[PDB]
Amino acid sequence: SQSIIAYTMSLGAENSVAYSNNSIAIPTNFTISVTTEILP
């Protein structure tokens, strides 16, 4: 039931940011993330 498929690639998920002339979003919490960078 597998096959090769061909498609136009997605660039990402779309997002309308909730902009208003007097609305702000402020983070109530944080995460600590560790990410790897590899260099020759």
């Binding site: 690639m9 660039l11 990402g12 998920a13 779309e14 997002n15 309308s16 940011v17 909730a18 902009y19 208003s20 002339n21 007097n22 609305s23 702000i24 979003a25 402020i26 983070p27």
Partner: protein, 340 residues
Amino acid sequence: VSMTKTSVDCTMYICGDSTECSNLLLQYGSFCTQLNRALTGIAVEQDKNTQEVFAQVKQIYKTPPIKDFGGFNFSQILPDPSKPSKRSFIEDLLFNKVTLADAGFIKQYGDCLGDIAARDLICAQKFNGLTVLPPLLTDEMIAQYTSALLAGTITSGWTFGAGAALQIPFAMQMAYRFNGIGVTQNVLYENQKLIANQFNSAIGKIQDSLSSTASALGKLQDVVNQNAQALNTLVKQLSSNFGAISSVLNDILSRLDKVEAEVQIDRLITGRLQSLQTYVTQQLIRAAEIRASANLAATKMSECVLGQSKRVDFCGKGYHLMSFPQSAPHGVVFLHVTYV
């Protein structure tokens, strides 16, 4: 940010469908595979370069239908829906300045034979085994990435760079910028109509200048010109005898027997093989200049668009407030905003 992807059939360039020349070319071993590997490595890197610069957003951000940005007017740099590609007004200006040669988007025989075949260099390249390959990202996809970078910036400031896009009013984002250059935020709010009118007028001068001067995108035109001049040089090296009785491989095979033709064909193989080794070395050297330029453009995207830079002269002249990316043919334009 990139250059045209090229592929060559080393056998159709050197030997042009002679079986006698093809049997002689096998005696040189791996060189035609090496030349194809090197050009394939250059071509994959043009897509890599474009992904490093433009694909810096998680999500394709949209601007709100209510454009209340505190009197700042982004209409000339935001998408225009009236067009098949959703580019900005300034991105259409930029796409008119730089003249391309072959996008890779199918050449289909009847568009290339007959009356057209004389008045064209691209059909003379293609009839000699040389082909341009299309980019992985279309110009519409680069414009969607640039739309998302600009919508993320004007709706959320630097916050879409570090995590989720957090909305903030645009004049409050601009007051943050003012604190970041050592100016107190009341200097923005007490001068907001002036700061907005000066921004709106300075963006109007970008539109006017790009509508008026010819050579401003000469940095991108130089790249297209070099890649075209290198391919025209490579096609013209087929006129060279390299000491053979003719450069025309069929005239050698029409007039000479099996053993006389082999000595003349080896002279053409030697010079045409050296012409490809020269072209591929020059293109490998260029590809490193374009990479270094794309790595700089990706760093300017991160540090000038997704942030506010404290680095001097990194994001224009003055104290950096913010930058806006615009897509251009094989390049990027940053519109850098500075407090002077």
